[PDB]
Amino acid sequence: ADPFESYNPEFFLYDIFLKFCLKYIDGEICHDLFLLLGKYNILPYDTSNDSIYACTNIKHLDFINPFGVAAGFDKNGVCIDSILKLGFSFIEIGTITPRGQTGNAKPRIFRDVESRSIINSCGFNNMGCDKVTENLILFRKRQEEDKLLSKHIVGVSIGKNKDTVNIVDDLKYCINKIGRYADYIAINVSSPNTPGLRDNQEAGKLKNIILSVKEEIDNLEKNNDEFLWFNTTKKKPLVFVKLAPDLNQEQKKEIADVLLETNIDGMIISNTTTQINDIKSFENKKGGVSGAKLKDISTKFICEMYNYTNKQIPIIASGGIFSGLDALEKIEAGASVCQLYSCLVFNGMKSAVQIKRELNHLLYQRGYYNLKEAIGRKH
Amino acid sequence: ADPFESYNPEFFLYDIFLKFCLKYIDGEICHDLFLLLGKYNILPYDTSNDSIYACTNIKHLDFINPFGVAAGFDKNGVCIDSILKLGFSFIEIGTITPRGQTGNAKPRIFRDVESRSIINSCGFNNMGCDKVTENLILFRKRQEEDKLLSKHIVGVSIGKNKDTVNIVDDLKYCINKIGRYADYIAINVSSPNTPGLRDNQEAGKLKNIILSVKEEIDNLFLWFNTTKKKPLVFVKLAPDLNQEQKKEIADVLLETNIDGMIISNTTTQINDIKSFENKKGGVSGAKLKDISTKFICEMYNYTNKQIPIIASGGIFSGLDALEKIEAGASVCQLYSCLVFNGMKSAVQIKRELNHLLYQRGYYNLKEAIGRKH
């Protein structure tokens, strides 16, 4: 790769520019710059063939590798192709809302490189469900003819507009608009930047929310020369819920009962935390903290929810995953698949290539024939 | 997407990223970002050969084409090769001083895209003559082994440290270090951002300064540059002088036997840019063009066409250039055109000027110098 050197995610120039943007350019602008490269398909891409021993699954959802991009990175779904070709097996676009939303005031993203941490208070900035659907549709039809993308998974994370009273109405609008094109739906009741939306994790309220979302998905069949499931699975999307790590033991057991009763297909553990207060540069800043100081939080949350749901609900891990050994901790804690965010910010384009390679060697060194043999083995 | 488009200065992606940085990223940061691409040789380049119909000269100094990069763009000379390969025939590094300086407080560069103007107050930030010299020597030694750069020109613009009393000593210190590697030296009495240094072009002092520089330069293969000859001596003038001061300075550069004059530096007389309300410094760009151009016609007249002119100020299009040349300039210098027009500026402006000279009946570019006149 002499001419192709510019498209290798590990090409040394990419971290020179990464270290520059981390040091000089506002975080949200660096994010927008990244999406601009993706939008015109001049992001580097991963040529590795993924190890068949490291694929994983949540029911009929078949991931070619265990790493995807967490929600909030391509909120509007404007360069799905490009980000996936970095080496990821799925992406969760969103969170989207019915009507487009400005978000909270700027700046709303701040970083601490020494500790590999992010704080943010974006407040569900997104273009709206109508526009994001059109973006996803255009990816789906490019997928119609592209063999390298035909097995990649796309989830959609849905939430409420800031000035909306009952969240069920807003989730319903999004499922009827975008549900037919998603391989799974993420219900976002975790976020800390929308006033009083983490109160929807009370067992009573969360139960009604899940049942509504399921009801609306099953009603899309008996509600209309067109393929109903315009996605990868070709089945109705699975329903996940993304949980906030700031709950006590009792709330966790109550939520576990609901996710068993309602027959949810998975849980995303976890969103950002408000409980970190030992980052000096985040002194006067507001919002939820992600990244390396979240890993131990998120992982112990995985073990409890794996235990409280009797290993019945598959887990998507999120929180402080940078290395292959970070990933193995999540998997051994109960997670079937992992989600990177702060790893892209601080490690850059190479994040999928590096972590897949590291985890492959780790699984062999620990004696696991494949990845599914490792799930929940620390228990 | 493929390399044969990513290294083309006219590839449309360069305007998408230009438009983005213009509206979202601090001006000095975009400049630093640009220099980073140059440092690692991932700027686009113009591989086309330049028409001999548009070559020019300042006495024995032969430019393959009439377009160069003004001072203050590669102050420290860290990607000379890369910038030249955009299509330019010379660049003027600097302005450098003996000892390095941070410069003034940040931010010190501001843009107004609508009017294509820049205001700045850097205050001669540079690494110092010692470090910059080392960078130029290494360009010269790579020039020794690349034929594609062997006819390109590199000037050096010289100034004084902010806290310095005798300017002659500091200009002398720079030539004794860097003069052997320069095709020409630019004496900076132009700038408005060094306290009371645009007042050092009073006829009394300015004469002693020029004689100082020439005396020190002549006291030095000796010449490791393109000329392979002693560097020629230029002066860059500030456009904010009255009629009386302009005729006096013209007398000196005739007496002192100067080789050329750079017209012009930035102006402080523009006050109708709404976005520059509370900002301080000198204004560049499109609103300086008419000013700098009339400055050329006066200086060409007061010097009886005896001293060639390097044009600088508000040059974006081929017809902007033809105005300068027809006014008395033998060569042109771009700054604000790179900021607002991006990687394509040398490619585009050369093509436009070539077509213009033909449409106007000019046998070559030198037939046009001072013809409006």
Ligand SMILES: Cc1cc2nc3c(=O)[nH]c(=O)nc-3n(C[C@H](O)[C@H](O)[C@H](O)COP(=O)(O)O)c2cc1C
């Ligand atoms: C700037 C920013 C925006 C985010 N936006 C969303 C979002 O819209 N929906 C969501 O479910 N999570 C969002 N998240 C949380 C991430 O998806 C992820 O769960 C969290 O950052 C922890 O993972 P990490 O430590 O690997 O980055 C956001 C995080 C950040 C830093």
Ligand SMILES: Cc1cc2nc3c(=O)[nH]c(=O)nc-3n(C[C@H](O)[C@H](O)[C@H](O)COP(=O)(O)O)c2cc1C
């Ligand atoms: C940010 C900035 C820094 C500059 N620094 C210098 C400098 O160090 N020395 C100098 O002679 N001119 C300097 N200039 C002036 C340019 O060389 C040029 O004369 C001026 O910008 C007018 O040309 P333009 O209209 O094409 O921009 C600087 C200009 C800008 C905008």
Ligand SMILES: Cc1nnc2c3sccc3nc(N3Cc4ccccc4[C@@H](C)C3)n12
């Ligand atoms: C890496 C890399 N490798 N080759 C290239 C080439 S080739 C022509 C342009 C070009 N730009 C880059 N970047 C410059 C840049 C600037 C600002 C923010 C991010 C980046 C990264 C994405 C890549 N390149």
Ligand SMILES: Cc1nnc2c3sccc3nc(N3Cc4ccccc4[C@@H](C)C3)n12
């Ligand atoms: C840097 C940086 N700082 N904040 C962020 C955020 S915030 C949400 C996403 C996001 N992405 C990044 N980049 C990852 C990356 C990788 C390689 C080269 C350049 C870059 C930058 C320009 C963008 N970010």
Ligand SMILES: Cc1nnc2c3sccc3nc(N3Cc4ccccc4[C@@H](C)C3)n12
């Ligand atoms: C143009 C162009 N053509 N190919 C590429 C490629 S290929 C890999 C990276 C890459 N980056 C760019 N730019 C991205 C970018 C980002 C921020 C500021 C300026 C720029 C410009 C210089 C070029 N590219």
Ligand SMILES: Cc1nnc2c3sccc3nc(N3Cc4ccccc4[C@@H](C)C3)n12
């Ligand atoms: C933008 C911008 N804004 N201020 C400046 C300044 S100030 C002194 C030099 C300078 N160079 C530029 N660029 C020209 C250019 C061309 C093509 C793609 C990107 C860019 C940017 C990143 C840098 N600048």
Ligand SMILES: O=C(O)c1cc(=O)[nH]c(=O)[nH]1
């Ligand atoms: O958009 C946001 O502000 C946001 C949403 C979310 O779910 N998590 C987060 O950290 N921020």
Ligand SMILES: O=C(O)c1cc(=O)[nH]c(=O)[nH]1
């Ligand atoms: O470096 C500067 O501040 C500067 C120098 C100069 O000559 N002209 C200008 O506008 N700024």
